[model samples]
Structure formats: structure tokens, C-alpha cells
Target chain A: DVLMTQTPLSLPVSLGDQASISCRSSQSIVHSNGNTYLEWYLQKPGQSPKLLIYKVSNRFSGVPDRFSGSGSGTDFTLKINRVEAEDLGIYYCLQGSHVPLTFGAGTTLELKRADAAPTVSIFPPSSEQLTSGGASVVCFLNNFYPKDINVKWKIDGSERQNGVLNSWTDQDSKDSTYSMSSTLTLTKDEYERHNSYTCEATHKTSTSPIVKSFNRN
Target chain B: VQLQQSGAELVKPGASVKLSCKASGYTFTEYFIHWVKQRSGQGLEWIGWFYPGSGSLNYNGKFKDKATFTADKSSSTVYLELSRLTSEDSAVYFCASHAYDKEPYWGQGTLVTVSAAKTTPPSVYPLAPGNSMVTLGCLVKGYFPEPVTVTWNSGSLSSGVHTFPAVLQSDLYTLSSSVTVPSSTWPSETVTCNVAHPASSTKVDKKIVPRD
Candidate 1:
């Protein structure tokens, strides 16, 4: 009546699979006209949650046939076929069958795929030797999966573990496959070595991590 | 992250339109920039997306034949080209820096008007007397909107409606409906022609009588 309790907070579905998630309401979600306004929504990544189904089994116009909503009384199921790359996001059930409206906690659809390794890069475009300091180098990673990434900085192929490092990774609601970037502040002494500085990114998707080389000028 | 979009465009049906969005603040190749469509009064529909780094694209199944995705890595921009435009394709389109986990940051929409001209009222064709049959035709031309339903009522003796094919003009629609009745219902009887178009509250009625 006042709340929707959804099951399985997260479901990692492979591409081109049929995914079914369930939602249960606190009370019976039945209207007087023998219709249930229990709706289904897909909170797509980085966009608004669109209404996929309204009044139980009836789908919203323009929706793909891959998506279907079904259920009655206090329970409902939102099923999507061929679980596409674009359908990666959270699914929710809202109960408006009563005077007061409520929504389930939400279900996250984390796309599972052994994606290709990211394209890594190490760059500052132009190097600058400050009168009092040196510039910073950024190691960037893009196009990886699972959002789990390991980044390392090295000079002349030798790894350097400690420095003023700043990193950013997309860990949003989705598996958040994104580019990971790490910045390393180089001192005047570190810049003196005219050797090759490499940035390597290791992801679960690949055995040999991607490597980017930045030769000193 | 911010997205800059192209200006609005005006095109005719059967023509094509291409929209572009440039991304900055974040690395251009870091994320995928997706395209979406919003008809004048309709909701948003995902068209497709492009990867600037590799020029890879994933088109929404519905728009497979209608949309094309291309990226200019040198310009740090993504383009969505739509061909064979129609009235239903008239809408505002947005480009977004899409992420799987969070909501995509969208660009200002670019309006694409698929129609160039408007519509007008219907014209009436003369009633002709041939042997024992009376042929009455009504011409509804230049109706931009579809569903041109013409009804002819004449004391329950009116002829059955006949619909003609469109595309009789360069870019306009020319529709004609005709009915045939017995010549015996002339003079003493009235023949009413009512032409109905969705865009107009207009009714073209022409009553002809046969004299002795």
C-alpha cells in the first residue's frame, strides 16, 4: 500500500539474455475498475527513468517488444529479452493502484561482458620545467569493462609506486564502464631523466594490460 | 562534461538531415555519446551512439534503417545522420555523454523540422451526368496532414466514396474522392459533398441540380 519491496538489488546479465526481476508491494495493488496501475520503469544510465509499463501487463507505447511487464495483486515482474548493451541500468516498480503512490527500492541491471582492454595514454602535450617545480603527467584509460582498473606509472619501464597521484574512475550506478585517469606529479629531478615513461592499465577483461609509452623530450 | 550541438534544421520529406555534437571537459574518447529523438509532442527515443575513438556505433533497432552514426576523432565530435525523412521524424534531437551507471549529460536539443510547407482546404469537382449515372467528385489538395476522409451524402442515395492516390504534386498531396448515383436522383434531389481533413474545419459542399 505504501511501499514496493523489490528483490535482488543487482543482476549481472550477459548480453542477449532474458532478464526477469521481481517486485512485491506492501499491500494489494488493485484498482476499483479491475485494473492495476502497478508500473515498471527503467532508470537508464545517465538518463531519466522512463516508464516502460503502466497498469500491469500493458506496455507503454513505443516501447520495444523486448520489454514486458506482468503481474497481479501484490507482485509484479519486469522482463526484458536479449538484454542489450543499452538496457543496462536499474529497473523499478511503482505502485499507484492505491490513493498513495510508492516505488520499490530499485533493481540494478549490471551488464556482464568480457570487454576489450582500454586504450591507455600518458601525456602532458607540452612539458614544462617550472623555475620552482615540474609539471604533472596524466595516464588515461578508456573502453574497459567492469569498471575495475589498476593503473601504474613508471620511468624507463621501472614502476614507481609513490608520488602525488590523483585518479578518477566511473563507479556510478551501472557497472560504469568508463575511462580511468591517474595523474602523477613529477618533480624537477624526475623530469631530468630523458627516459621513456609508461602508463599501464590492467583490467579483468584482458590478460596483458594495455601500455602507453611517453618518451621524454 | 559538456556537449555542444548543431543548429536547428528545416528539411522536406524524402530529404536527409545530419546533426552533430562536440564534447569537451573530459577526454572525447572516454565515453560514448548517444543520440536521442523527441517528436514535437512525443517522448524521448534513443536513436543510436558513436565511439569517437574507434568509430564504432550501436544503433537502436528501431532506427537501424533511418539513422547513421559517424565520428570525427580529429574534431572530437559525433554525428547522427538521418535519411528519408518523414513527418513523424520532425522533432528535437539531443546528444549526450552517456555512462552506464549514471544519467547521461545531454546537449541542448537540435530541432529538425521534416516538413517545409502547410496545407489548405479542399476543392470541389463538377458533377457530371452520364447516361443513367451521376458522377460527383471532390478534390482535396495540398493537405499536409494525412487521413483525408471525404464523405458524400445525398438523401441515402449518395455514391460510395472512392479515394485517389497522393503524390500528384512535387512535394504536396493531391487527394480526390468521387461517388456515383443514379441520374434519376437529380433535380428533385440534393447531392451533398462533404470533404473532411484533419488539419481543417473546412467543408466543401457543392450541390448541383439537373434542370428540365
Candidate 2:
């Protein structure tokens, strides 16, 4: 059995500062292979996890010497000296000595800068996009950093609780930003009676949620 | 009051299944029957509930298109129809009565397992329960010669593990094994399922990550 835990879930540090993360296991991680089976990994923004330290303290090939690991048994530590902007992301420590491998709760290393907000736009349903019984309207959001966002649809001033679908956030390969779309479909008769349709997008980066509306003709 | 659910179901991917929950020991039309979904070692999810008296239904927005609910008052039975099934749809389904006075009467959950179409090796899937406990699953299906040895990493686990009996369907055999561990180490650790199949000369190590 494997049980790993990490501390300092959120780490705020200035450039060139030393950062350290702690990972502990419920059981001793010494394997029969005569070496500790602890490893460390870092996940850069919008990238896969990359190994940094292996066998407790040995750095992976091409990894900078600024990163180091120490401790044994159930307690371990990963230290990064002179942290850089490229190192802002999440770090995890893994234990491989047990039958069921386990990972530590990740620690997020970030600067004090504010996150980027999204640009919101709404598109009305064209005749070609309409079905016989109803029409679907699309709300598009673009260029958002950190993909945690909530969206809601409103008809006139009333909030709708059904007939809404939100798509997964897609990352832009060129800029590493994120984009998402939400759709709201309603009966043709309801659209005829409704004066305005609104899409409300909320993100933690902005003080107020972004809203866009389409006037039905 | 009792809620008797139908037997377990083993269906193929992309097919459909209709599960039954027959109510007894009380007035069936007086209360609503709610269907819940529980993946192995995961939390409970409310699919929807149906009021037999008014013949009205309400569903979870996440499952609007995947599940349909209906009930027959005369027979005191409720039905849940799931369509276009996938691995995500494999779970235990339970039907319970919605009443104001006391805890809801529960039915023994019916397990619905969705298997692949053709013969293949075991495909291990890692799932995170987001709690104190974590469970890993190894799905062995579409193979002949029922004997398959499944182990975690390198050694066999006798305790804190469950291996289901091999199920034969359409000339293929399917077996599943699950192991539970503390949640603290998941998605951080790399636990693999080592499957030794008679069909192949070598054992396969499957360590697919959790969807998260």
C-alpha cells in the first residue's frame, strides 16, 4: 500500500528565491532493491509532468543542479534554489517502493501577478443553424489563462436551468491560452417571445463576470 | 418497504440496457423512486427521480441525454434506460424511495459492467475517488482460456483486494480485479497492473492514469 502526502499547497515566491516542498509517506519507502524509491516531478503550465529528481536525490538528465532532494524513510523534501519564471507550476513527489504506487498532493509555485481574464462574445443562431422546432445560440470565450470558469445562460432576465451544454476548454498551441464555448437551445416559440439572450462567464481573475447578449429579431 | 432491483448486467460498449426496480410493502404511487449511480469505490451520483403518481420526471442535467426514467404504477415498478453506453457508464445502480418521514428504503445496487467487443488483453484503468481511499481497477476482457493472473506492480495482494469471477459472453471471457489504498499517494504514484495471459507469451503492465 502507498500513502503519500505533501505540504504547502500554495507556494508564492519571487524570482531567484529558494523554494522547498515536503512529502511524507505513511510507510517507509525503502524497497528491497537496496535504495529508496522516491522520485520528484514538475508539471509546467499546460505541459506533462517531467521527472526532475529520481532515487530520492539524483537529478534527471538535463535537469539543473538548482533542484535537490533529501531525507529518507517516510519523510522527504525537494528543494529548488533560484526559482525561475519557467518553474512556476505544480510539483509532485512519487513513491515507488510499495505495490500500489502513490503520489503526494501537488504544491503550486506561482508569482504574485494577477491571472489573465477571458474575452467573451455571443453569436445568434442563423437560419441555417436552426432546426424545425428550436434554435441554438453559442457563447464563445477566448484567451483565458487557467481554465476554471463558470458559464450561465439567461433568457430576457430569467435564468434557464436546462437545455445548456458546455464544451471542454481547449488550449491554443500557439499562445498556450484557453478557449471554451457554451450553447443554449430553446423552443422557437420561446425565442419568438424572448427579447434578449445573455451569456454570463465568470472567472476568478476578474472582479466582475463578463456578459454578452444577443437581441433576437 | 422494499426496493428490489434487477440482477446484474454485462453489456457491450455502445449498446443499451434497461434496469428494473420493483417496489413493494407500501403504496408505490405515493412516493417518488430515485435512481443513483455509484462507480466502484467512488461517491454516489443522483441520476434522476420519477413521481409515479403524477407520472412526472426530473433528471440530472449531466445525464439528460444518457438516461431515461419511467415507471408503471400498476406493476409498482420503475425503469432506467441507459443508451450509448461506455466505460464511464459502468457502475452500480440503486433505486430508493423518496419519503419525508424517514431514511429512504434502498435496494441492493445492481452492477452494470460494460465490456469491449473483441478479444484482447487486460486494460488497467486508474481511478481517483478524491477522498481518503483510492481504488485501482484492472479490466481483463475479450480473451479465451479463462485463467489470467493479475497482480499489482509485482506481488499478488490477498487482502484489501477483490477479484470477480470470470464472465463469459459471446465466446469471450471477462474478469475484473480491484485494490484499495490510501488516497494520499494517488496520481502521484505509479501503480501498475501486471496481467499474465495465456494468449500471449509476455505479461502486460498497464498503468493508465486517472482521467482527473
Candidate 3:
């Protein structure tokens, strides 16, 4: 079994900043028969780590091309280009082709706010939920930092003051995390079930409010 | 593809066993084998794996001392032999290529067992004022490395654990176990050997001697 250690070269780059991490193996991963088994992963601050590259540079299922891996033999590197707000967190590298499988220490990418307000973004968007004749649902932001934030819900491009909103903040030795959840109950016949809804997450550091929207099917 | 296996043997009544598995696939020195055990009627236990190309073996800590695994690329055949074969050792054993945390491809297991005809019937021996020693044995037929436990109940001995000895014949291996118990427990108790495998819904138990 060999040990693999990784160290980030710099502090987390702000949003949109580039980040790189290094992975080193105790022994040459190059098998006598050929093939390198090094791999890389991304562990966002609060989310489970996801595989980024496997078998040396080959991306696993569903990973985006924005995440690239390179390097050979005992040395390897993982690079994330045009980093987005969601990319903030730790990154790791792993070697599975051999014994004593191990994971590299992680690197965290921070957000750099150019202005007074911070910005958060959700990619790929969320899906709409439908229930019989009416469609009403809630979107919750479970992983937020520095809590004490506000949440707003809207229907058909208009703010709904009567909607439900909840917020909470948590502080630990290392950092502060926040969470917000909102629920909406609507009464509509089958014909009006196809309406639009949006939930936005807001904070003082946010440059622009993070809004997640969906349409009833 | 070449497969390497560990060697083991049991002399009806003894204790402890060790085994190994070496492999030679398309790239003998470059690939690894994921070792698995299939006890009769039981499912497979992912024993861990050995990277023959790297000469390294990772074992599930649960199986730590109970099972010691090793591999050699030169042989190309992985081996698994048991030490205590009190009927519970009867099962098929297999070796397959390592697939990270996923179901793996397996090799046909080798069946090993201890036959009643191969050893003298169990006998009793008094030890302390109340405790005594009893020797028992069982024959396991197929070779699968599922979790198997052999226990002594009644007959000539009251109660005690059985041990297997390591014995190798040709390419197959066998094992045994022995235990000391109280003289008061005899004939009335039943010595049962149970075999367990991951695939099995329940363990397979057999009494050393059936009574009316």
C-alpha cells in the first residue's frame, strides 16, 4: 500500500478564479504491465465528495469538462477552470489501482466578492413538483454559510407576501453556515395547475440574489 | 487467465486457518483480483482484495486474524484453504478481478470437507474438577469461503469448542478444532457445525451424529 498526499498551492480563489491542487504518490503507480490508476475528486464545503477523474485523466460518468485532470506516474494535478460560485470547497485525489488506497488532503476554494454584496448561483436548475389538480412546493437551501438570511417566494413573477419562509444560522470553530426553507400552498383547479414559481436566497454578501425557479408540469 | 491460491489443511479437530490468492489475467503483473467467499447456500463475502501487480493485500478488519490473505504473481492461481473443517468448512471458494466497491467477476470455488470416515470418532478427556476436554471433527464438502462456525454440543462430551489442524493434500487444504468441556454434558447435547455465506438467507447446520 502507498500513501498519496495533496496540497493546494494557494488560498481558495474568489468566485470565477482558477484553482489547482497537487497529488503525490509514495510509489510509482505505473504498473509493470502499463496503465496508471490515479484519480481526482471534488468535495464541496458541505456536500459529499464527487469523482472528477479516474484511471488517470479519464472523467467518470456525468462530470463536466470544466473539470480537467492531468499528470502521470506518481505526480498528478486537478484543475477547475472558470470557477463558479458552486465550485467553492475542497478537492482531493485518489489512487485505486493499487493497495492501501488513499485520499489526498482537500483544498477549499473561496469566493471573492468584488462588490459589497456576495453572489450565489445554482446550476442546471431545479425541477417542478406537481400534485393532482394543484401544484405547490418549496425549495430549501440547506447548505449556507453565515446564516441569518431572508427567503422570498413568488408565483408567476409576483412576490407572494403570504408564503411561508424560514431561516437559521449556525456557527462552529471553523466557519458559520446558514439554511433557509420556504413552502407554498396553493389552491387551483386542474386548468391553472401549470403555473410558475420561484424561491430566492438572499444575504448581505450576495452580489445578486440566488434564485431557483421551476414550472409546474 | 492464471489464478493462484493459498494452501491450508485441517486434521478433523484443531484451530485457525490461513490462505492466499494470486492472479494472472491479460496483464498478470498489472491487474489485481478481488477475493470473495461463497459458503454453501450463503451469498458472497467481499473479503477484500490483493493487487498482484503491486504485491499488496487489503483485508476487511473484521476478517483480520481469522483470515490472512497473500498473493504471488508467478503462480497465476489464487488459493484459499481453511484450517478448521468441522463440516462448516464445506463450501466453494473463488477469486476474481478487483472492481472498486462493485460486484466482481469470480472464479469457480474449490470445495473442501472433512469426512467422518477419515478420522476417529470424538472422545472425552477429564481436565479440571468440573471441566473436561472433547475432540470432534466434520467433513466440509465444497470450497466456498463464507463465514462458518463449528460448535460442539453433546454426545461423548458435554460442551466445548472444536479446533482444526492444518493439512495439505495434493493441491487441496483441510482444518480441524478441539475443545474441553464439563463431563456432566454428554449424549444429551448436540454438536452442531454451522456454515454461513453472504448469499445465504440462513446458516446450514449439521449434527455430527444424529440420535433417536
Interface RMSD of each candidate, angstroms, one decimal: 29.8, 22.2, 29.3
Best by lDDT: 2
lDDT of 3 by residue, A106-148 (tens): 5555543232221222111111112323333444454355434
Better of 2 and 3 by DockQ: 2
Highest DockQ: give the candidate number: 2
Task: State in Å the error of residue A141, model 2.
Answer: 3.3
DockQ of 3: 0.01
The CAPRI classification for model 3 reads as: incorrect
TM-score of each: 0.35, 0.43, 0.32
Model 2: per-residue Cα lDDT over B45-88, one tens digit each: 56877878777887777788999998776778889999999979
Poorly placed runs, candidate 1 (over 4 Å):
A1-16, A24-37, A43-48, A72-75, A82-90, A97-115, A128-134, A150-178, A184-202, A205-217, B1-212
Model 1 per-residue lDDT tens digits across residues A106-191 = 78787665565765545542222234465445554654676667887877877887753433432333444555546455676667
Second chain TM-score for model 3: 0.43
**For model 3, what is the alpha-carbon lDDT of residue B62?**
42
> Which lDDT values do the candidates have, in the order given?
0.65, 0.70, 0.49
For model 3 the local lDDT of residue B168 reads 33
Error of 1 at A7 (Å): 6.2
